[PDB]
Amino acid sequence: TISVTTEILPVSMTKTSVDCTMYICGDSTECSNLLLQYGSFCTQLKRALTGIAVEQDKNTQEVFAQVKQIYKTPPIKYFGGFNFSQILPDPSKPSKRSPIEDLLFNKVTLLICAQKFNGLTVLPPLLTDEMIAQYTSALLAGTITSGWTFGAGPALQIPFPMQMAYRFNGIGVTQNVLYENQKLIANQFNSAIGKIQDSLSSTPSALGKLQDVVNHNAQALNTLVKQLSSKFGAISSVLNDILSRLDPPEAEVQIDRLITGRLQSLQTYVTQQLIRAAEIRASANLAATKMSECVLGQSKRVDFCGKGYHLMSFPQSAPHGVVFLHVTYVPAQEKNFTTAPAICHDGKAHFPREGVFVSNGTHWFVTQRNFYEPQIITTDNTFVSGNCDVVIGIVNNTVYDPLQPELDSFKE
Amino acid sequence: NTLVKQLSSKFGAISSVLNDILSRLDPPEAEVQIDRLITGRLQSLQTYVTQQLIRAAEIRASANLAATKMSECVLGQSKRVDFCGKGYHLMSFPQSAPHGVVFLHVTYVPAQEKNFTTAPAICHDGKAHFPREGVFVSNGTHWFVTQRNFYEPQIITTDNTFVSGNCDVVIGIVNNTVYDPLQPELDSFKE
Amino acid sequence: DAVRDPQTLEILDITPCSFGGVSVITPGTNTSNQVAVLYQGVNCTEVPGSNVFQTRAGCLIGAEYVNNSYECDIPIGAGICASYQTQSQSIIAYTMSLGAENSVAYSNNSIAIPTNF
Ligand SMILES: *[C@@H]1O[C@H](CO)[C@@H](O[C@@H]2O[C@H](CO)[C@@H](O)[C@H](O)[C@H]2NC(C)=O)[C@H](O)[C@H]1NC(C)=O
Ligand SMILES: *[C@@H]1O[C@H](CO)[C@@H](O[C@@H]2O[C@H](CO)[C@@H](O)[C@H](O)[C@H]2NC(C)=O)[C@H](O)[C@H]1NC(C)=O
């Protein structure tokens, strides 16, 4: 059974910047002179947020920008009967995005913009959505046209059924299994893509991580703006009323507590953003590693690129994240048999070159491990090692020689 | 440097020097003069320690990645794609650096390309012949088998291929002759 | 956000000041001395000598938009990057080039095999 699963990984968040004077002081003059005496806190906060923004710009570059050249699919689209229409971009839409990417964009929902006008500025990302989609399309065209050859060096053309035969040969299944079951595997793959198209749409809690990222950013900015209107043990929370009602020698000490409160709130916001940036960096590094291993090649690591024996992976872009579609091979309907470690023929122990000795109850065969394909035990399927009295569990059988009867028939 | 510069601030006090304040006033409000200096310097120290903790947390992850790369790339050969350099990994060499390590990754890259005609299987006597390892390659006239990552054509023999099924189920099978190395030597020397 | 006028019974919406950050774009100080100026997130009708360009990131003054595409050198944002080059020497702004465009001649009976390494 061919199975196709999802994995959603956040890659970045929103880039933000804050002003020293404007947030703490509402364009007051003496407030600036009082804030200047404290030192250089907001220089450190500005450098921290600038480093965070540069890191967030680098995070998306380390994941998507991994191809040397931009690839395209041929205008004719027939890949061995496999049908890739759900992941390739649709030229009818003015944005070259697949139906899966359109569904992921419409699923994530990004007056509150005017409230963040107290020194807070949201900076746009360097890479826009169309450019990231062009990277995604180039990766898809490279991985369905050239296989894993373009990830190491120059791209080498190969037919897709032969690429599937190569991928089967890497998980312990001989390539004759695919070529004798091409239509069934193509139908299973198409059915899996058709099911996973609306598996995300049926459940509204699938894209929890990206929504959590945008909600965390929104509530952090919102609670900063809320805390801007607090009193911190003063007579008033607005500077213009308190400066214009008391004389400066008492107004100074009365607004110093406002300065300290707003400064501490800024420090808390910057520290929380730094911790979230570290977490997002770890997630982006994991996503970049998964793009390098699952998409550009075949991974032998267990449960890394999905559940089961890994076959391929396809990348899709999402708001502040990436989605991997892992295509894996899963075993199915089982049969049990009696097995032996070796075969005794003429006082010599015969061990399988590759596979396993199987009996239905009457005769003995040798077959490959992950698929039932019994064959006659010949002298080329086995190798001789030692005598018969050292291996326990050895059984009585014969080994057919494809050489002796040809000579004793043809020579005479 | 920022810590040492910040040490010379006032934080709302009359002076930035403790000895200047102490020799200027009497104690019972010199203590409230210096309490603001105390608050500012504790805040500065806590900020510095928090930043150092975050930077050390980042440095730990970088060092763990470096240790993993030293264990995998240098002490063995890695099959992970684009881990120990670009291309098929061959070797790696470590070098020391001030507060860091430098890995020299030796890898293998294909250089010059040619295209041929390919088939998934070969039909000989109503039976399908699949490659044991490699790929079927035609220059235009005859058919050979070769390994994947290097061009090395060889005559299609009965030891380079294996038999699986008849000649009616594989899409794209072509007609060819598989040379048996056994029967000409037995048709020459027996007679 | 909005107020009623006390004399005429009228809705008035209030929007606060534009403001924003200013940034400078320069090459190395030994290469040249001329710079470009970026005003972040503002419309170019609120900035007060030609070569004024409107960008989704902001307003850019001192650099000219070129329809060609190159590798990014100094990033502004929204796919816009600046560089110092001839056309004598000047600072230009452009859209990023992702890479060389390539076509792979895929076919159902063709394979490519390397002959050298
Ligand atoms: C690949 O899958 C797509 C999507 O299911 C198929 O497009 C459908 O084709 C049928 C038959 O003409 C139409 O009724 C549907 O409306 C099409 N769907 C869409 C979304 O356009 C497509 O035919 C498949 N490709 C092949 C070669 O069979
Ligand atoms: C497997 O075959 C061997 C063939 O030699 C059997 O061993 C012989 O069994 C007979 C009958 O009991 C004895 O007379 C011989 O002395 C045995 N020879 C040896 C070398 O032990 C053997 O019994 C068969 N079965 C198993 C389970 O091993």
Ligand SMILES: *[C@@H]1O[C@H](CO)[C@@H](O[C@@H]2O[C@H](CO)[C@@H](O)[C@H](O)[C@H]2NC(C)=O)[C@H](O)[C@H]1NC(C)=O
């Ligand atoms: C494909 O390769 C075969 C390899 O045998 C080429 O056939 C040989 O060509 C050379 C050069 O003329 C002759 O000296 C040999 O006698 C040929 N061998 C045989 C068995 O006939 C063949 O020419 C190649 N085809 C192309 C189009 O280059």
Ligand SMILES: *[C@@H]1O[C@H](CO)[C@@H](O[C@@H]2O[C@H](CO)[C@@H](O)[C@H](O)[C@H]2NC(C)=O)[C@H](O)[C@H]1NC(C)=O
């Ligand atoms: C070469 O391949 C062809 C098909 O391209 C085979 O021709 C078939 O042969 C069988 C058995 O003789 C006939 O029943 C079919 O009618 C043939 N098909 C066609 C389309 O003609 C042929 O057997 C292969 N081998 C040789 C030696 O010619």
Ligand SMILES: *[C@@H]1O[C@H](CO)[C@@H](O[C@@H]2O[C@H](CO)[C@@H](O)[C@H](O)[C@H]2NC(C)=O)[C@H](O)[C@H]1NC(C)=O
């Ligand atoms: C593979 O490429 C190498 C270079 O990477 C080729 O070696 C060159 O061979 C020519 C012809 O003899 C010499 O003039 C050059 O000096 C060689 N270069 C180097 C770096 O040694 C080699 O010939 C190529 N192999 C094949 C089979 O084409």
Ligand SMILES: *[C@@H]1O[C@H](CO)[C@@H](O)[C@H](O)[C@H]1NC(C)=O
């Ligand atoms: C297969 O297992 C079942 C129990 O699960 C057992 O009854 C049966 O005999 C086994 N078959 C063979 C051929 O050993």
Ligand SMILES: *[C@@H]1O[C@H](CO)[C@@H](O)[C@H](O)[C@H]1NC(C)=O
């Ligand atoms: C086991 O397989 C062989 C294959 O020749 C067959 O003859 C035999 O009947 C099978 N055993 C049973 C119990 O069906």
Ligand SMILES: *[C@@H]1O[C@H](CO)[C@@H](O)[C@H](O)[C@H]1NC(C)=O
């Ligand atoms: C190799 O590819 C080129 C185009 O890249 C094509 O013209 C040529 O026919 C191909 N050669 C063969 C033998 O198929």
Ligand SMILES: *[C@@H]1O[C@H](CO)[C@@H](O)[C@H](O)[C@H]1NC(C)=O
């Ligand atoms: C105030 O005076 C203006 C003068 O034109 C008039 O239109 C308006 O209706 C007056 N106020 C009220 C509350 O009606």
Ligand SMILES: *[C@@H]1O[C@H](CO)[C@@H](O)[C@H](O)[C@H]1NC(C)=O
């Ligand atoms: C800038 O203001 C002008 C004048 O109102 C307007 O036409 C233009 O669309 C504005 N530009 C942007 C990018 O909003």
Ligand SMILES: *[C@@H]1O[C@H](CO)[C@@H](O)[C@H](O)[C@H]1NC(C)=O
């Ligand atoms: C191989 O390619 C052509 C053109 O893309 C396609 O229509 C055809 O079905 C394939 N060839 C055969 C013999 O099936």
